[PDB]
Amino acid sequence: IFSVDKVRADFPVLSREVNGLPLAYLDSAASAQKPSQVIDAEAEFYRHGYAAVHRGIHTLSAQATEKMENVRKRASLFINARSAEELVFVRGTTEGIALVANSWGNSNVRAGDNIIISQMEHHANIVPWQMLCARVGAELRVIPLNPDGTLQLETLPTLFDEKTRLLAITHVSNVLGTENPLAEMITLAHQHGAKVLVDGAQAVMHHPVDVQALDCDFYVFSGHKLYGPTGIGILYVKEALLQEMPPWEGGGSMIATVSLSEGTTWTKAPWRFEAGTPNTGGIIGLGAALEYVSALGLNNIAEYEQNLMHYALSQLESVPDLTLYGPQNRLGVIAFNLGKHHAYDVGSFLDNYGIAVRTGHHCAMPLMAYYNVPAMCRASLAMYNTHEEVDRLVTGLQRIHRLLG
Amino acid sequence: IFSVDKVRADFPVLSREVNGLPLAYLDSAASAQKPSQVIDAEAEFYRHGYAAVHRGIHTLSAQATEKMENVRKRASLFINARSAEELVFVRGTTEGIALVANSWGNSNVRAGDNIIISQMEHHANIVPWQMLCARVGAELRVIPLNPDGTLQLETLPTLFDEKTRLLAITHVSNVLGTENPLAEMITLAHQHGAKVLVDGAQAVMHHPVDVQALDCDFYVFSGHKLYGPTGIGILYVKEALLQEMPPWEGGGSMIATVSLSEGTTWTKAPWRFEAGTPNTGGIIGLGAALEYVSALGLNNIAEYEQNLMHYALSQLESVPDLTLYGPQNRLGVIAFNLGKHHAYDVGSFLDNYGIAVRTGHHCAMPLMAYYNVPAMCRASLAMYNTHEEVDRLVTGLQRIHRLLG
Numbered sequence: 160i161f162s163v164d165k166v167r168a169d170f171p172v173l174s175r176e177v178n179g180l181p182l183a184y185l186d187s188a189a190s191a192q193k194p195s196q197v198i199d200a201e202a203e204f205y206r207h208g209y210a211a212v213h214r215g216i217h218t219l220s221a222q223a224t225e226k227m228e229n230v231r232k233r234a235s236l237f238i239n240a241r242s243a244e245e246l247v248f249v250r251g252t253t254e255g256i257a258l259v260a261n262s263w264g265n266s267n268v269r270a271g272d273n274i275i276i277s278q279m280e281h282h283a284n285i286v287p288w289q290m291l292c293a294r295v296g297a298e299l300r301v302i303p304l305n306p307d308g309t310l311q312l313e314t315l316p317t318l319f320d321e322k323t324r325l326l327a328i329t330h331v332s333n334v335l336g337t338e339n340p341l342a343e344m345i346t347l348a349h350q351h352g353a354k355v356l357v358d359g360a361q362a363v364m365h366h367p368v369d370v371q372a373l374d375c376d377f378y379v380f381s382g383h384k385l386y387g388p389t390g391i392g393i394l395y396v397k398e399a400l401l402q403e404m405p406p407w408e409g410g411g412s413m414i415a416t417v418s419l420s421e422g423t424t425w426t427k428a429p430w431r432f433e434a435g436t437p438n439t440g441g442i443i444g445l446g447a448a449l450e451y452v453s454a455l456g457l458n459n460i461a462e463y464e465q466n467l468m469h470y471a472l473s474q475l476e477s478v479p480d481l482t483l484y485g486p487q488n489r490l491g492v493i494a495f496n497l498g499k500h501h502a503y504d505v506g507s508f509l510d511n512y513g514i515a516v517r518t519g520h521h522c523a524m525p526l527m528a529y530y531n532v533p534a535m536c537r538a539s540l541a542m543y544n545t546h547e548e549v550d551r552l553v554t555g556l557q558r559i560h561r562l563l564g
Numbered sequence: 565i566f567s568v569d570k571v572r573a574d575f576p577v578l579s580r581e582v583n584g585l586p587l588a589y590l591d592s593a594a595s596a597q598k599p600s601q602v603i604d605a606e607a608e609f610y611r612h613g614y615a616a617v618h619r620g621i622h623t624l625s626a627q628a629t630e631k632m633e634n635v636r637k638r639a640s641l642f643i644n645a646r647s648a649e650e651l652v653f654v655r656g657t658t659e660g661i662a663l664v665a666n667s668w669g670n671s672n673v674r675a676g677d678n679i680i681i682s683q684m685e686h687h688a689n690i691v692p693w694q695m696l697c698a699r700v701g702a703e704l705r706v707i708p709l710n711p712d713g714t715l716q717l718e719t720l721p722t723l724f725d726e727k728t729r730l731l732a733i734t735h736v737s738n739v740l741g742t743e744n745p746l747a748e749m750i751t752l753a754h755q756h757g758a759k760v761l762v763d764g765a766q767a768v769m770h771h772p773v774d775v776q777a778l779d780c781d782f783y784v785f786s787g788h789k790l791y792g793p794t795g796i797g798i799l800y801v802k803e804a805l806l807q808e809m810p811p812w813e814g815g816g817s818m819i820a821t822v823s824l825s826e827g828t829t830w831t832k833a834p835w836r837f838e839a840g841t842p843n844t845g846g847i848i849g850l851g852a853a854l855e856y857v858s859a860l861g862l863n864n865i866a867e868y869e870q871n872l873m874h875y876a877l878s879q880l881e882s883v884p885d886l887t888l889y890g891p892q893n894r895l896g897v898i899a900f901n902l903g904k905h906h907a908y909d910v911g912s913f914l915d916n917y918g919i920a921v922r923t924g925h926h927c928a929m930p931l932m933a934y935y936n937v938p939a940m941c942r943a944s945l946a947m948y949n950t951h952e953e954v955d956r957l958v959t960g961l962q963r964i965h966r967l968l969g
């Protein structure tokens with residue numbers, strides 16, 4: 160069984176005080192706190208084994224190159240990719256999606272084609288496709304939402320056709336906590352020869368993820384949401400696709416040869432898309448984060464978080480004039496507004512009690528617009544959050560409602 | 565005065581053993597070791613103040629946003645930019661140059677124009693321009709080299725004309741240690757209305773850099789070469805230029821608004837070019853690295869390194885059949901080959917003695933080709949290297965020459 164007290168003791172930030180009160184960090188969906196196992200792994204690398212990593216001749220460089228490729232292997236096993244060489248290190252989910260849209264998009268999406276996104280997508284999974292569609296003259300289609308925060312799947316027959324090149328879809332909504340039916344949607348997309356990119360930035364920390372079972376063509380996620388360092392993400396691409404992708408004009412690609420007369424050639428994928436000095440510190444920390452999470456067990460984490468979520472939704476029923484957004488079976492986040500008060504004011508009061516939530520449009524303005532609100536509040540309930548922190552959130556909202564209503 | 569023993573005691577890697585022998589790290593031009601002040605600043609941030617940073621409502625987020633903007637201010641003072649808002653955080657020098665070539669290049673370089681690079685450029689300051697020139701149908705012109713590793717300045721009249729849009733030039737060669745006459749070249753470029761991008765990745769750790777005095781239009785450098793963390797670089801752009809640059813299609817740009825019907829708008833520069841979650845860990849560490857280097861004083865560092873370089877070049881005269889490449893007044897690096905032996909073999913023997921040098925083409929294949937060699941060895945002499953490590957290098961080359969000659 161999972162022991163939240165043993166886990167919390169690994170996270171030094173959770174001791175912190177904010178406004179003279181004990182921190183209740185409910186904003187892990189924006190970024191997760193990191194255990195000392197992650198922080199110290201990165202520091203230890205800088206302290207005892209740091210070097211540049213392009214299979215340099217000397218020992219530190221060779222050993223650091225091997226550390227980085229072992230992390231690539233560990234990450235591929237974490238998401239059950241067939242091969243470590245199907246994983247590209249990227250700056251984060253945002254850059255990973257941009258890479259696909261520029262390298263794969265520019266040579267597979269032509270004038271008259273269409274791309275399907277959903278109305279709940281984070282901006283990082285909208286804007287690259289908007290721009291691509293403008294470049295090549297294709298059409299961006301949108302799966303609409305239901306009031307309960309799920310996709311209107313009945314609209315799919317009107318969106319998928321033979322010119323559909325790509326479905327770009329979120330695994331788990333960063334606002335609603337909706338988990339989308341990826342395996343079925345991927346079957347539909349592949350029946351039309353469409354690829355699927357899955358934005359998995361909110362999924363990989365909540366339960367096991369198996370890209371072979373899903374059969375998705377691309378999958379992205381962010382280190383810093385996975386209790387890991389900033390500046391590092393993972394992009395998975397099916398080997399047959401990845402080995403056809405051209406070099407990344409926009410972000411830089413690693414060369415095989417450079418000639419002023421004869422031009423330039425490029426090294427094989429993965430590494431083709433990792434130009435310049437990689438973020439070795441971040442890669443080391445990401446590896447430690449994958450080990451930490453695997454050691455707790457994602458199924459134990461999921462069971463604890465689901466129980467915590469069920470407790471919170473039950474307790475929140477006693478908050479007057481609370482509006483919740485999203486389905487009952489949400490993962491990780493609770494999106495809400497309190498009566499007619501602006502989310503910004505609710506979040507400031509909650510911060511005044513030492514409760515960290517996020518306010519605003521959460522990089523999902525089309526989602527905001529669907530619900531005809533400018534902003535919502537969002538509380539994250541991660542593996543190190545407690546029933547007691549849920550009770551502070553509930554009491555906090557009750558007090559805010561009396562003081563301001 | 566500078567005390568190399570007091571400085572070395574700040575760097576924990578320098579205690580390390582390699583192949584059972586004490587490390588002599590002479591590969592700082594590939595990446596620098598980091599002091600504990602840098603390592604611990606990053607760890608301390610993760611331990612006590614970590615949060616997401618997009619001016620979030622709650623305290624940790626607000627305080628982390630302010631930490632990151634103070635580092636931007638500190639970096640702008642470090643290079644004497646007029647305004648902190650002229651600095652963009654980037655993944656590294658490679659990504660910074662790609663950003664300029666894609667955002668500024670695509671809307672200022674048209675068919676029939678030309679760009680001037682030099683023959684000693686690192687690949688990161690060649691390939692983006694090669695691709696841009698192919699996109700828009702412009703011409704890539706090259707300032708050639710002299711045998712001593714300096715630019716043939718007499719060729720400039722034949723390269724600069726009214727269609728010259730940009731000069732992209734290295735401040736200090738990562739292979740030869742040549743320092744280029746930037747201020748004079750920038751005057752010439754501006755007489756034709758050409759902009760200048762300076763690749764300063766090898767300059768910022770060796771002496772003060774003043775972008776107002778230089779009057780360059782762009783300037784880039786890498787954190788990890790500045791005794792700082794990986795995954796972070798600085799791109800400086802003159803405010804009038806930067807505020808005109810369009811969003812970065814290839815790498816992602818931060819939105820002001822996203823609408824599925826009305827399209828997308830973008831936030832003001834700096835931040836326009838920092839999409840997704842920034843590398844907050846790396847930014848914090850970079851700030852500590854700038855403080856550490858400022859506390860030693862760049863002029864003291866320069867005086868120590870110059871003395872160390874002069875000692876090494878004097879000692880190396882006693883190595884039979886040593887070929888050196890570059891001018892006598894080189895900064896930081898010594899590029900060399902030993903008789904007819906492949907650089908790879910020399911580097912392996914040196915590594916066997918615990919001496920870390922770099923071998924290969926050093927991401928400067930046109931430079932290699934100018935000298936009609938496939939590879940060279942390169943020893944870096946940074947601020948924490950000693951006369952004794954120079955003596956190990958010299959003795960090592962002498963032994964290699966007897967064993968293999």
Ligand SMILES: *Cc1c(COP(=O)(O)O)cnc(C)c1O
Pocket residue numbers: 188189250251252253254281283284329331332333358359360361381392839840841
């Ligand atoms: C946060 C998030 C992103 C963006 O991730 P970055 O690490 O900031 O690049 C994209 N999609 C979802 C669903 C997210 O939650």
Ligand SMILES: *Cc1c(COP(=O)(O)O)cnc(C)c1O
Pocket residue numbers: 434435436593594655656657658659686688689734736737738763764765766786797
């Ligand atoms: C190392 C270096 C680069 C590339 O820097 P990255 O940090 O790897 O992106 C570019 N130019 C010069 C002169 C360099 O030494």
Ligand SMILES: [Cl-]
Pocket residue numbers: 282522523819
């Ligand atoms: Cl956004």
Ligand SMILES: [Cl-]
Pocket residue numbers: 414687927928
């Ligand atoms: Cl290269």
